Symmetry: D2
Subunit: 330 residues, 4 copies
């Protein structure tokens, strides 16, 4: 009668603890195991048959590519199981948007996958995690969630895992998309207003089942008087692609362009993103001659999202034209 939902716990503020009820912002992440999360929301038994597993127990700022692969592979094993209807991942906020996008690209399933965190620990007055987790389970149990790609369910919203980002610090409305929420979840019911347009999950060319390793990708920032130092150092320490987090429309300083040309000739993919992250996108051939240089633009994707897509894409191709297509379809 009720859906079978599995909760995969990774740590985070949602599993965190502070010293008193007034500690909404100063806490230790990743203190409570998945069984204590489930025990703290007894109302979950009203909306689904829930089982929990601990995949990891980390502050998400310290996540690694090996962690992503472990989580992605477990999600795929559960998605293939006839006994599983939906999956919830409890996660720290800091890199929640990276995990959600990674799963959106590599999980070839129409089964709902929801990633959820909290801005306050469960010890705090007015802690947000209990209702976030209830909503995540509600959404993971809802037929309307099938085929919608990875979702994030914080602040009573249904956000696309593709382009939701941690945009506001401290407040519970932290996660926003340039392209809006797709829906809302209220008193366990989902209300949809938009659908995804971009390739995901079942329509993805990528599959975690065929990924055993991820290429190293790093990010360097653009600002006044920036030099080529970080770009060269990152490449010298193994980066196979650099995400340029440029000013404006992925613009590159005249002090940095020559190093990026030299790195591209040395086989490093050069992907122009920006730190202009509330809306718009980076236009090919506008601020830099990407065709002449054989560079790629990240479209609307912020730097950390562009890193995820580049890493997944480079499991399959190092062709800059193919990478640009991928950045325009996902």
């Amino acid at each position: 009668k009720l859906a079978n939902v599995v909760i995969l716990a990774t740590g985070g503020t949602i599993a965190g603890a502070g010293a008193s009820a007034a500690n909404s912002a100063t806490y230790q992440a990743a203190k409570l195991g998945v069984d204590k999360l489930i025990a703290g929301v007894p109302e979950l038994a009203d909306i689904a048959n829930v089982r929990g597993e601990q995949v990891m127990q980390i502050a998400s700022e310290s996540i690694s590519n090996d962690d992503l692969l472990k989580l992605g592979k477990r999600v795929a094993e559960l998605a293939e199981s006839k006994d599983v209807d939906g999956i919830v991942i409890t996660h720290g906020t800091d890199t929640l948007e990276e995990t959600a996008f990674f799963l959106n690209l590599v999980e070839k399933t129409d089964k709902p996958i929801v990633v959820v965190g909290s801005m306050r620990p469960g010890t705090a007055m007015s802690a947000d995690g209990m209702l976030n987790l209830y909503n995540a389970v509600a959404v993971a149990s809802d037929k309307q969630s099938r085929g919608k790609g990875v979702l994030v369910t914080m602040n009573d919203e249904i956000q696309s895992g593709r382009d939701v980002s941690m945009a506001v610090n401290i407040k519970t409305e932290a996660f926003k998309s340039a392209w809006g929420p797709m829906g809302m979840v209220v008193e366990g019911k989902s209300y949809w207003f938009r659908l995804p347009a971009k390739r995901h999950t079942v329509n993805s060319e990528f599959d975690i089942k065929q990924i055993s390793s991820l290429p190293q990708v790093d990010i360097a920032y653009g600002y006044g008087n920036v030099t080529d130092t970080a770009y060269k150092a990152l490449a010298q320490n193994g980066a196979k692609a650099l995400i340029h987090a440029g000013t404006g429309n992925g613009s590159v300083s005249s002090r940095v362009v020559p190093a990026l040309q030299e790195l591209r000739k040395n086989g490093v993919q050069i992907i122009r993103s920006s730190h202009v992250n509330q809306g718009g996108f980076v236009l090919r051939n506008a601020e830099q001659p990407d065709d002449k240089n054989d560079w790629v633009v990240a479209h609307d994707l912020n730097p950390q999202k562009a890193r995820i897509l580049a890493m997944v894409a480079m499991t399959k191709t190092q062709d800059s034209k193919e990478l640009q297509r991928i950045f325009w379809e996902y």
Copy 2:
């Protein structure tokens, strides 16, 4: 009767040119001289006595610290002149927010200083620069602008140069502040709704007249699987402070903390900012033990803004407690 306004041109898209009227996003910056910009808005003569000077002719993504000092010293000379009532600076968008904040810290004048750019070049259909420049001159000529600190006048808004940032790519509403616009400018008239709270201009402890060369400060990004490589390389190549553009509330990967402790022990200031830029702020001692490590938080300041404040602050102090006070006052 009319105010005496000087326009200091530095380049940018507002001085740009594209190949066709439909080229609103693909153009070359810094092509038109200040006399051509002034001649493109003959209505300036109705609202002020305007004179133009060409300080530099750059795409603002390529600005240097020596460019900031040249511009800041020319602004100081003009502010000291009885014959100047207000100052407008035409600037590229990419680092407009950095220049505006710098001038807000180092110009000890109550004379209006307005920084303005455009998202479309003057060759485009529906180019925004003409009305942006008219509005900048209107605000620079208005007695209500005196003592308000440095202002930015795009999109019919009066924004604080402190915390306005380039937040949306392509669109004319690019410049936004987490704390809102302070006012609007419409048909030459200024309408105020908020005042600055933070220290600026006449109440600043800093003065451009004292600064000969700015200290080197660099920025490193935080993301999944980040290593200490960029942080160490930037310090090796001369960084006196490192702005950490962390995930979430300025969080630091467990892979990076030991390097930042070693760098602080070797005299490099460690300032925790974030790429969570739509609202909120980074809280001292929350994600990291700043007191134990002698680190600084950047409060609400985005990484490029924190870099500007760290450079100015270190012309006066190397005491981390004084740097934290400055990050809480400015």
Copy 3:
């Protein structure tokens, strides 16, 4: 081969004129005919084969139901023509959102229909109307626009005609949706990030071909110390439904509930909307017992949008359960 686009002119600021180039906000609407509007953007020939018709010449604040029917019927005649690929409607901003939603409900066509205005008259410095009209023709000429419902193309955005609203005065970013833009249009190219979820155009149960008149529907506002006066007066002067623009979640004053029960028994449909228009929705049975009173909630639709849906819906049904279904599907 270029698309054949018809421009249907109705008036508005985009056809407006002010006394001087500095008049961005003080002007007269509906002065320029469609042939002069088209002649002002000769670049339209690069993206489509365009012809103009003058349907009407009004300030949109003064639109009537007879004007909607005239425009809707003309759109339908063009959409049935094999010689028409797309339709652009130039329109005043004030009720643009009402016309766009009306057409989204009643035009049973997959051919693109775009509604466009401007915040500044074409006489103004940095007038927005030329690029808005270029973008409207670009989107109306694009195969990606087929089957997406009615679209609004201002501020470089592709907004859904369903739920875009005039949200910001004066500024060119005036039109916003709670559910985000669906895409952007830049240098003639359309970039999509979301799809509509709600029923529209070809999947609508409503058809302008079967509508010869519209039921009278009026709107009354909720606030502190509101009385039942406006509600009763509007019904006495022919309203067949009343849109309640409530405080909060469509809340109704205890001073107004009895009048609404008497009006419902008298056969007036009662639809709870709100003046809380930036996000969320009005929940059935939450603030008022809608099932007991036989009332309807407007879901996320603002009062003027709810009026349009009620008026179209009541051409087909006066069954309150059917109207609630319609408010949940469109």
Copy 4:
């Protein structure tokens, strides 16, 4: 020694109760007395000496002018007491913005006055009221709050009572200002980023001590095919001023202008506001000839705020030029 704060309870969702923990949106307001609210936040004793009074027990959508006066007069008595350092008012969300603006105009004190509500009842999972009430008391007890005018402390923000509005339904981020938050409150500490520019409290020309009964003011909505019916009926039933909630920049249908000219000639003040409430303002003489007609524009104020200012203003003046000055200063 702790500040003495008095909590004045008026009802609302913050005092509400739902049937179960999953009832975040469906509940009964105004169920719990002030002593139970205070008992539900035992941490209040750490930050202030609190006492509670029950002023009334209502759902705020049903507030009256006499309720405003009863609360305003009690606030005045407490502000005049040496034993009171700060005042918190617990309130329903629906008309919280109206009460906060009223108090901002009529309380001639620099003592902190905070108005607070919740979007979820205290019975819900992740109820927001506990931390909102803690934050209200923290802000009411803070020296930084003195002289700032009336404040609203929801969602970790410090918002101006002047121009904060209920803008988002259901979500805890409901309260927003076009001009941004002025600050934040985190772990009991206040962080300021802007100051008010408009007249309030100690600099107000109005005083609650002089007002015995407020004049009747009503609101009529503008939309396609609107008629003069609601305007005339509201005036016939005693409105001394009509707030016109127009489309766009307070625009008036050509079907309505004649009635509004006649009402003005008969002594009814005509104030043009709008239902365009996310930003911008209504410009005098732009959409209508206000000077010719002796009408007033509401500036940036939404209709329900404009009604509050019009009521207070008309306790002093019937001169439309003085009313316009008031609408430009407050």
